[PDB]
Amino acid sequence: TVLDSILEGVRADVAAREASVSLSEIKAAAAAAPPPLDVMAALREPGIGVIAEVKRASPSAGALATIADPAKLAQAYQDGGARIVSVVTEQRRFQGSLDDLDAVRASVSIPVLRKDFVVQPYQIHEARAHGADMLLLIVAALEQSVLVSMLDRTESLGMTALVEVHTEQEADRALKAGAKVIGVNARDLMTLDVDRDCFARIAPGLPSSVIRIAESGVRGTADLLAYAGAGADAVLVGEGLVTSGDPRAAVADLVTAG
Ligand SMILES: O=C(O)c1cccc(COc2ccccc2)c1
Numbered sequence: 512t513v514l515d516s517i518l519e520g521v522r523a524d525v526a527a528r529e530a531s532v533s534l535s536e537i538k539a540a541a542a543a544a545p546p547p548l549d550v551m552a553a554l555r556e557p558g559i560g561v562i563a564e565v566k567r568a569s570p571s572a573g574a575l576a577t578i579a580d581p582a583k584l585a586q587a588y589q590d591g592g593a594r595i596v597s598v599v600t601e602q603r604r605f606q607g608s609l610d611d612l613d614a615v616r617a618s619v620s621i622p623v624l625r626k627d628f629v630v631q632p633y634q635i636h637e638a639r640a641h642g643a644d645m646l647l648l649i650v651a652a653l654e655q656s657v658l659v660s661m662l663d664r665t666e667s668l669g670m671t672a673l674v675e676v677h678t679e680q681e682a683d684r685a686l687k688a689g690a691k692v693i694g695v696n697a698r699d700l701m702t703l704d705v706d707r708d709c710f711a712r713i714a715p716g717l718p719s720s721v722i723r724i725a726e727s728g729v730r731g732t733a734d735l736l737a738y739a740g741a742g743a744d745a746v747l748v749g750e751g752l753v754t755s756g757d758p759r760a761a762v763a764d765l766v767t768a769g
Contacts, residue, residue, distance in 0.1 A: 513570055514628075514652060514700040520603045521628045529633050541639035541668060548622040548644040550671035551691065553594055554722045559739045560594030561765045562624060562724065563758075564749030565615060567599075567606040571703045574606075576753040581611040582618035584758060589619045591762025595645065597624040597747060609641050616642030624673060628652060632664055639668045645692075648672045650681040651700055659688045675726060682713050686721070693717060694724040694747070714742040732768035739769070 529537075554560060565581045568574045578584055585596045598615045599607040607627075616623050625643035629635065630652065638646045646665050650658060658674075665672045674690035676682045677699055685693050695710045710725045717723060722745070725738035729748040738746050748765060755761040 512701055513703055514649075517570075517601070517604055517628055517700075518630060518652060521601065522630055524602060525631055525633055528637075534633055534636070537633060537636045537640050541636040544640055544642060547639070547669040547671075550595070550622045550624075550645045551722070553622050554671075554692065554724075554745060556594065558766070559735060559743060559768070560724075560745030561592065561735070561762060562595040562597050562745055562747040563588035563591070563593035563752050563762050564597035564626065564747060565599060565607070565611055566597075566626070566749045566753055568604070569750075570604050571698070571705075572750060575750060578611075578753065580614075582614040584753070585615040585619045587759035588752065588762050589621050591759040592766030593621060593762050594745060595622045595624055597626045597749065599749075600625055600627040609637070612638075612641045612643060629661060632661070635661065635664050635668065635670075639670060643670060645671045645673055647675060647694075649675045649700065650684050650688075651675075651677060655684055655688065658684065662688050662690065673724060676713065677709065679713055679716055682716060686718070690721065692722040692724060694726045697725070697727040710738055710743065711741040717742075729765070732764060735765050735768045 567578050598612045599605045622644040624645040625638040626647050662672045673692050673694050674685040675694040675696050676685050695713050697707050697709045698705045707728050714723050723742050724745045725743040726747045729746050735746050752758050
């Protein structure tokens with residue numbers, strides 16, 4: 512239920528934004544934005560992809576990094592071989608914002624994942640408007656019919672949904688929804704505990720045609736390699752990069768791991 516406190520805050524913040532930027536305007540801005548990059552193709556490149564994350568804080572970690580210049584951080588990440596950059600845009604717990612997403616989009620060539628708690632269609636068009644190529648959808652946040660439509664609406668905008676699951680039952684739900692990319696978060700969003708055995712419990716269960724991303728728990732090459740050994744096509748890494756004095760070297764170590 513950390514999820515739910517995060518979610519009530521999100522719904523209020525979206526409504527307040529929408530009051531200043533109507534759903535019609537954001538729809539128009541999304542429609543008008545340059546088309547999204549082909550994230551599936553990027554995910555299918557040789558090697559384990561490193562999805563490098565821009566994140567200032569979290570409920571679990573507290574303050575991680577000031578990231579005065581998220582564009583510059585994302586530049587380091589691309590220089591280091593990152594496949595995708597994840598930008599957290601939730602303001603109250605993670606101290607992110609859309610501005611970060613704008614800054615990252617303008618500064619890198621690799622695809623950009625908007626990492627936030629997608630509860631409403633507004634945020635989907637908003638993601639597209641602000642340049643996201645990939646959008647996080649959290650199965651534990653979303654009732655199935657809503658999941659299905661959020662997924663459908665994401666893909667109708669050209670974006671790839673990174674459908675995040677924590678359990679085999681969530682996985683099954685994701686698959687039934689039409690997920691092409693499934694992320695397994697070692698972290699339980701209700702309680703914030705990081706169970707590392709998750710990916711390897713779940714990943715074997717998935718069709719081979721589905722792309723598998725290991726979210727969380729990556730401290731270095733050994734964790735990357737372990738997820739790699741359990742079927743990961745890519746890993747998402749944030750805490751160890753944002754707190755680095757040399758994020759490009761930290762990324763480059765992971766990109767070349769093995
Ligand atoms: O580290 C934590 O305390 C934490 C709590 C809830 C979610 C996540 C990770 O997933 C997301 C999803 C959207 C935006 C940011 C993090 C991490």
